[PDB]
Design an enzyme around this catalytic site. Structure first.
Site, PDB file in Angstrom:
ATOM      1  NE  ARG A 207       1.011   5.982  -5.533  1.00 38.52           N
ATOM      2  CZ  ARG A 207       1.869   4.988  -5.747  1.00 38.52           C
ATOM      3  NH1 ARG A 207       1.571   4.014  -6.617  1.00 38.52           N
ATOM      4  NH2 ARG A 207       3.018   4.957  -5.080  1.00 38.52           N
ATOM      5  CG  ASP A 232       2.998   3.696 -11.270  1.00 41.23           C
ATOM      6  OD1 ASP A 232       4.041   3.020 -11.101  1.00 41.23           O
ATOM      7  OD2 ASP A 232       2.522   4.442 -10.378  1.00 41.23           O
ATOM      8  CD  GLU A 503      10.286   5.396  -6.030  1.00 37.07           C
ATOM      9  OE1 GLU A 503       9.313   5.399  -6.832  1.00 37.07           O
ATOM     10  OE2 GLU A 503      10.205   4.940  -4.866  1.00 37.07           O
ATOM     11  NE  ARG A 519      10.618   0.975  -4.280  1.00 36.87           N
ATOM     12  CZ  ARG A 519       9.445   1.116  -4.889  1.00 36.87           C
ATOM     13  NH1 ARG A 519       8.914   2.331  -5.068  1.00 36.87           N
ATOM     14  NH2 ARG A 519       8.801   0.043  -5.316  1.00 36.87           N
ATOM     15  NE  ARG A 581       5.017   0.800  -1.498  1.00 38.90           N
ATOM     16  CZ  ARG A 581       5.038   1.178  -2.776  1.00 38.90           C
ATOM     17  NH1 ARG A 581       3.959   1.727  -3.330  1.00 38.90           N
ATOM     18  NH2 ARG A 581       6.136   1.003  -3.507  1.00 38.90           N
ATOM     19  CE1 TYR A 615       6.093   4.867  -3.892  1.00 38.05           C
ATOM     20  CE2 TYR A 615       6.865   6.822  -5.053  1.00 38.05           C
ATOM     21  CZ  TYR A 615       6.785   5.441  -4.942  1.00 38.05           C
ATOM     22  OH  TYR A 615       7.396   4.627  -5.873  1.00 38.05           O
TER      23      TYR A 615
END
Ligand code: 7HV
Length: 658
Positions: A207, A232, A503, A519, A581, A615
């Site tokens: 990622r 994460d 971000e 963001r 997304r 992303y």
């Protein structure tokens, strides 16, 4: 071997095509392979590409199908009511729809192997599932099969799962072809992989892609090599890099820019079932979110990432502590020794471990790799490996000793359980990286550190100034260096949000003028502007014409080198969707020289609005094409966790976008 059946150019226009007469009496034995090249740029919500079924009254649950969803998910069903078998195997985000406005030819290979009792699906040269069962069901051994169908499944005489698309080629084989044979089937992919499962990182997942074009023309990429599924931190994650010297056509075998060794680098198939998918490697140190910049002056490449000690994510990071102690304007990394309730140690100059309760130094030193030495002898810890053999995640010692690191669970001396920012550099444009160094705290002793904005840092064109955006609660915190990253200072820019994952990525509109896009939690991408090379920042404005979800997604951005419609241009990369997304776009904006406002004039659809895009990383390649490395899936959705090979790279030209 040759196919038992081969046909092509079938148009699926919401009307199935019967191929029973051509195919059914050809099927023999219990193992089969299906090879299919198909397009579906306007799929129905749920549609079957291929079906074998018992079409008779009372046997509606006796069929094999290959189906897809408009989310890009691919799967099969294999059902026989008499046998009491209802298999469904599938994986989200396995498909392409369109590229440069043209329907993509997907290459699907399904292997049904009676010997190994295993069903395996590949799409576009990527294995998306491999499932072994105790009770195998050959696809043509379903009770009473009497129809072979393209573009639907015939159940009780009616067309179910009607498809819109086309099948340019379909072949069937009375054999389970090997992985080797599969690999030789020609593909028509619109994308390439830079990082992938089974590569040198041995991470099964990736990622947080980055891309940056170096002055030599080499293009560099960095990424989270994620071992414990796509979670994460807390997990095990290393930062890996690869470069291309031919405008993105080919990429080097990855190396690590930042790595810990308290846990083995293991390629693991992370469970995707609801009971286990939230399993998390919980005792490993880790890195997360990298960012790259190049310094004109030294010629060095600089890479920053967040760092977490063992067990730590942002979720449980000591929010009240920087992990450093201030002494006379200098900051020293704090350490806790095995058995103490408090942190009574610091790491002073030359890595001397120093006792604070009595101001006495110790016989312990910390080397440059943050490893512990006693009297100059390097201490070790036993490494961990992880497995799901017991039916749940276990983390256990594996017999191997590795250097004892203060970020490790088993270390004699431990850093504060909070988030840090590390820096490494390369003097050979990404062929090797130095041992990382922790950046100092910027917001004080008792403030936990900021979070790096992944992607690119900014090298101002008309000076030596280097800037990396970071975020914390209530502000962007820009890290600024004018001496090749030897020293950093902060520039704080308030934003009207608390606890946002803000971000942020920057572009230089013109000399000394920086626009940062970031963001937010509002459903719109925000921006602010600096006109003094990052010293001061404007208030926050928002972009109209692009939608994000309430939780937001990273946005990447570059200043294009060439004029467009006679104007200076900026290109943004983001999902465009208030729902998920998905709906990836590159949006081309033209700068109004009167006031530096931006007219978002062109929107380029990366792939279907319903196909995943999260992303992303964008760079202007040396030949003026645009390179895009992006998560091609919904990396927020709890249904699309732990997918392999969904971070993908494409090459575009400006004329494709406009
Ligand atoms: O949930 S997503 O928006 O896909 C990714 C957000 N990751 C933010 C972040 C940054 C640093 C750390 Cl240490 C953690 Cl745990 C999370």
């Amino acid at each position: 071997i040759s196919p038992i059946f081969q046909g092509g150019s079938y148009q699926l226009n919401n009307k199935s095509i019967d191929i029973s007469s051509l195919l059914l009496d050809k099927l023999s034995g219990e193992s089969q392979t299906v090879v299919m090249k198909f397009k579906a740029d306007k799929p129905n919500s749920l549609q079957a590409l291929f079906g074998l079924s018992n079409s008779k009254a009372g046997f509606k649950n006796n069929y094999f199908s290959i189906f897809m969803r408009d989310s890009g998910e691919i799967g099969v069903e294999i059902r026989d009511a008499q046998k009491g078998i209802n298999y469904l195997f599938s994986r989200p985000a396995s498909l392409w729809g369109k590229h440069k406005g043209q329907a993509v030819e997907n290459t699907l290979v399904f292997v049904s192997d009676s010997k190994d009792k295993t069903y395996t699906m590949y799409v576009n040269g990527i294995e998306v599932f491999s499932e072994t069962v105790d009770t195998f069901l050959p696809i043509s051994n379903i009770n009473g099969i009497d129809k072979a169908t393209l573009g639907a499944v015939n159940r009780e005489g009616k067309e179910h799962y009607l498809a819109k698309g086309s099948i340019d080629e379909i072949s069937l084989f009375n054999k389970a072809i090997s992985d080797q044979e599969v690999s030789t089937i020609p593909l028509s992919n619109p994308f390439q992989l830079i990082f992938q499962s089974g590569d040198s990182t041995q991470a099964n997942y990736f990622r947080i892609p980055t891309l940056y074009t170096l002055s030599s023309g080499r293009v560099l990429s960095s990424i989270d090599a994620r071992y414990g599924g796509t979670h994460d931190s807390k997990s095990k994650i290393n930062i890996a890099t690869s470069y291309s010297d031919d405008n993105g056509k080919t990429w080097s075998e990855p190396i690590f820019a930042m790595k810990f060794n308290d846990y083995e680098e293991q390629l693991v198939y992370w469970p995707r079932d609801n009971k286990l998918k939230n399993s998390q490697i919980s005792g490993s140190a880790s890195f997360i979110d990298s960012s790259i910049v190049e310094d004109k002056k030294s010629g060095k490449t600089i890479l920053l990432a967040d760092v977490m000690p063992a067990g730590i994510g942002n979720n449980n990071a000591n929010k009240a502590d920087s992990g450093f102690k201030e002494i006379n304007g200098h900051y020293y990394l704090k350490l806790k020794k095995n058995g103490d309730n408090d942190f009574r140690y610091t790491v002073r100059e030359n890595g001397v471990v120093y006792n604070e309760t009595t101001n006495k130094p110790t016989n312990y030193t910390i080397n440059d790799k943050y490893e512990v030495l006693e009297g100059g002898k390097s201490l070790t810890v036993e490494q961990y490996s992880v497995d799901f053999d017991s039916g749940s995640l276990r983390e256990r010692h594996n017999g191997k000793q590795v250097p004892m690191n203060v970020f490790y669970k088993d270390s004699l001396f431990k850093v504060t359980p909070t988030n840090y920012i590390a820096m490494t550099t390369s003097q050979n444009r990404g062929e090797s990286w130095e041992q990382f160094k922790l950046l100092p705290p910027f917001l004080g002793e008792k403030h936990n550190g900021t979070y790096l904005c992944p992607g690119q840092g900014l090298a101002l064109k008309s000076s030596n100034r280097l800037i990396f955006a970071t975020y914390t609660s209530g502000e962007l915190t820009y890290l600024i260096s004018d001496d090749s990253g030897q020293t950093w200072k902060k520039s704080s820019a308030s934003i009207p949000f608390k606890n946002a994952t803000a971000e942020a990525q920057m572009v230089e509109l013109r000399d000394g003028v920086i626009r940062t896009f970031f963001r937010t939690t509002t459903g719109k991408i925000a921006y602010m502007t600096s006109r003094d090379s990052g010293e001061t920042w404007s208030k926050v404005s928002y972009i109209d014409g692009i939608q994000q979800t309430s939780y937001g997604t990273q946005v990447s951005a570059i200043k294009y080198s060439q004029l467009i419609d006679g104007k200076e241009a900026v290109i943004l990369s983001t999902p465009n969707s208030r729902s998920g997304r998905k709906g990836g776009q590159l949006v081309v904006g033209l700068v109004n020289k009167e006031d530096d406002s931006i007219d978002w004039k062109y929107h380029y659809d990366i792939d279907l609005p319903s196909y995943g895009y999260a992303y992303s990383a964008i760079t202007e390649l040396p030949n003026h094409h645009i390179g895009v490395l992006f998560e091609k899936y919904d990396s927020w959705s709890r249904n699309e966790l732990h997918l392999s090979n969904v971070v993908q790279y494409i090459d575009l030209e400006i004329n494709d976008l406009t």
